Symmetry: C3
Subunit: 112 residues, 3 copies
Amino acid sequence: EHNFNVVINAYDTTIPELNVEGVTVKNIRAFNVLNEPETLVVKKGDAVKVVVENKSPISEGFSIDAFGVQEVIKAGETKTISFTADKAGAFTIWCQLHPKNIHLPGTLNVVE
Amino acid sequence: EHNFNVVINAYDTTIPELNVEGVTVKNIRAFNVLNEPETLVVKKGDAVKVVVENKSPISEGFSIDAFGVQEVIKAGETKTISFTADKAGAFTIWCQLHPKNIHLPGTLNVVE
Amino acid sequence: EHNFNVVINAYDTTIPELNVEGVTVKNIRAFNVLNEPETLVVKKGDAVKVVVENKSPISEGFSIDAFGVQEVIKAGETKTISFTADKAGAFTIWCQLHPKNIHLPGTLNVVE
Ligand SMILES: [Cu+2]
Ligand SMILES: [Cu+2]
Ligand SMILES: [Cu+2]
C-alpha cells in the first residue's frame, strides 16, 4: 500500500444558458483537465508512489520539478510515479504538455 | 482549530475587455463555484468537522468518496459535515451535482 | 532560509480550434493567474516564510485573512511574506485585487 491515486480527467463544458433553481447564468464555457486529487501531502523522507490514471482522451503530463518528476501518461493509461520526497516544501504538480490554466496545477506538500 | 470552515462561493465574471496598468486582456468569461478553502489537511484518526456554508445561488454538493461523504447544501444554508479520517491519503473533495471544471474540486489530505 | 517558494503566473489562453492525437478541442478561452504552488502546508506555531515571485504582468495580491496577511507584489517583483501560523485550520490564500475565479485561490493548511 501507501500509493496515492491521482486521476487525470478532462472536462469540456459548454452551457450557453444555465437555468436551474430560479438562477440563470449565460455563456458558460470552460475546458479543463484536472488532477483528482490535486494536492498530495507527505512527510519529508517519505517514499512517494502515485498511481496516475489518465482518463483524458490524450496524453497528459505529471511533473514535479523538485524531484525530477516529468512524466507523460498515455491517454487511457495508468503510470505509477515513484520518488522520495527528500526536500520539505510546497511543490507544484503540473502538466508540462498543456497550458496551466487549462490543465490546472496541483501541489505536492512535503512537511517536516 | 475545533473544525474547518468552508464557504462555497459562486463567481460570475464577465470582462469583455480590461486594461490594468497598461496590460490588456479581452473576452474573459468565467463562471465558477469554489470551495474556500479548497484543501483540508488532517491527521489519520482525526474526527473531522467541516462547517460548509453554501453562498452559491443554488444547491451545492460536497463529496469525499473515501469517507462516504456526500452532502447537498441548499443555497444560503450551512451544514456541518462530520466524519472520521480513518484512512491516510489524498481524497478529492468534489461537487456531485455540477461539472467539475465549473465547481472546482479540492482535496482532503489525511496524513499519518 | 528554506522557506516556501510561490510564483504567480498569468495565462492568456485562446484556442479556437486544435486537434491533438485525433482529438479536436474548440472555442477554448481562459485567462487566469495562478499561484504556483497554490497549497502551503505548515505546522501550527512554525514561522512561515513565503517568497512570492510575481511573474504576472500586473501587480498581484496575496492574502490570508486568518493571519492578517495581505500583500501587493508589483509585476516582476519578488516579496517575502512572513507570519506565524498561530492557529490550526485551513485558510484561503487569495488575491485581493482580482476576481477569485480568474486569479484562483489556494490554501494555507496549518496542521495541529
Ligand atoms: Cu495536461
Ligand atoms: Cu457544485
Ligand atoms: Cu490577482
